[PDB]
Structure 1
């Protein structure tokens, strides 16, 4: 049994001194990844020390929530920790230097940008690994999902007619293009996530007002019901640039595994990881806003049903399967092997 220090990305609740928890109260993809990962590791019998998320729920046996929020506190703690593995999800807020002898260092890269710590880095997709300059011996391990955290077939959530966009309402996430696709289909689009870019938000409401229903940041129980009740989820990441530098390349798209394990198929673009995961649970479409209604409406009406997408999601992305893939890499590192 391994002692695993899982380092969440340390971020404050917007406008607040509190740290975002794992799983998060509101918006936060990485924090969901760590929650689902953590459940896998604990189910496998490993001990988990969660860092960078103080105040997170702490009940699970095998789980210790470490009272270290900021980077310096996390580094201080790691220097004296008796753990076998430090598994970084922060994008390199911490690094291997200073860890006690014998401690393995591993990362899950969640960014379009090239990693701070390439050595011992894993990628959620081949497209990301390539884009980030990761070598062929770097593991590709997609985003996990724990079905227990999502609505099940037995919950019998009634299907609604609305399409669903769930993430930050930002151009590279393709909120506008999702409005266009919903419009093409004659459907409503719930825009569930933070819409902090006012000119962008305003353009969507101008062009597709009668289509879109913007509800703002969601979380908790409503988030889960939306995921389950939606007719389909639209993951429409666009190949555009921005303040990250270079072309946007969706690293792992947690919403894909989330929708499907909640029994909801996905329409997406082929951006980044989407080319790899969307076809398993729905259909890839083109970039831009120019969707022929006949095609769109057929794309939508031909998507897989709940049982199929849930099945696929558990087989490919199930928390225990993905956690055991990580443990295999932890042991690789512990035996003295390395990669970049």
Structure 2
């Protein structure tokens, strides 16, 4: 079995000197990746060391009290692990690691990575857009069904469409509102709204469709993912040009028995069709084609099974351990 350090993106609760946790109390895509990843890792019986997230006891899991990047680099210089798995985007790197420690990253950004050697990408669209070479492995966002509402949880479906993410132009909140209005359905707008003008223009334009609820967390987040009719993942090629790297909410919605309407943006082209349908860019959604797009979305059972088949936390973590071992074997790229 491996000892594997998971370097989470080091990040402070806004306003606080407290840390954002893995998993996160609210908004936080990468911290969710690490959490369904570490769960998988541990189920495979690997030893996990959680860094950049000083956070929640389970066997095999060590939460290192290191969050400051220099606290991490220091801890990592003397750490007795086999695999440094960076999820932070290069807050730390390969140099200064003890000899025979393998370096690996999962790339979660639209920009080219600090550390392209031993880098992995959420999608082929991402790899391409970041300049990743052909032998660079593409490994999707993983999802632990245990973190999310199951069929056994008995959460009933309701009428609304759901947006969960930052209320920002590249996330397509306005386009979500335009789709939901085209279907004659409410959009619950769950997410941090930090850009006032764009928020106000959403409500000015689709005020009667959208219900803004702010950033959400814990039980509410899971109940919302579980109950929504569809989750809207409508990222837009705006200024990068925005290419969605891995689209965290697509595995969450699907694993919560919720199908997805998204765009073909970056990674959405590759994953959305497995659990829903891809629509075009913009806000010009003809109503009946839209309601028609809604009514050919799979059922809770089929998306919940596609999620696990394709992105299951154990399956995906096994795809990573095979890389860790290529690395430790003397394998490299790119």
> TM-score of the superposition, structure 2-length normalised?
1.00
Q: Aligned residue for 1:230?
A: 228
What SS does structure 2 have at the residue aligned with 1:303? Answer: coil
Structure 1 counterpart of 2:6: 6
| Residues 208-265 of structure 1, C-alpha deviations (whole Å, 9 max, x = no match) | 0000001000011100000000000000000001xxxx21000000100000000000
Find runs of 4+ consecutive structure 1 residues off by over 3 angstroms: none
Structure 1: any 5+ residue segments left out of the alignment?
Answer: none
CA offsets 1:285-320 (integer angstroms, 9 cap, x no match): 000000000100110011100000000000000000
Please give the per-residue CA displacement for 1:257-292, whole angstroms capped at 9, x wherever unaligned. Answer: 000000000000000000000000000000000000
5 Å-filtered alignment, 1:165-314, equals: 165-241=163-239, 246-314=240-308
1:316 partner SS: helix
Cα distance in 2 for partners of 1:108, 1:116 equals 12
- Which secondary structure does the structure 2 equivalent of 1:329 belong to? helix
Aligned length: 334
Q: Per the alignment, in what secondary structure is the counterpart of residue 233 of structure 1?
A: strand
- State the distance in 2 between where 1:270 and 1:13 align: 32
Q: Within 1, Cα distance between the matches of 2:295 and 2:134?
A: 38
Matched position secondary structure for 1:107: strand
1:137-189 CA-to-partner distances (Å, cap 9, x unmatched) read 00000000000000001111010100000000000000000000000000000
Question: TM-score, normalised to structure 1's length?
Answer: 0.98
Query: Structure 2: where are the runs of 5+ without partners?
Result: none
Instruction: Output the CA distance in 1 between the equivalents of 2:300 and 2:26.
Output: 25
CA distance in 1, matches of 2:217, 2:138: 28
Q: Using the alignment, how far apart are the partners of 2:50 and 2:153 within structure 1?
A: 30
Q: 2:316, 2:203 → 1: CA distance?
A: 39
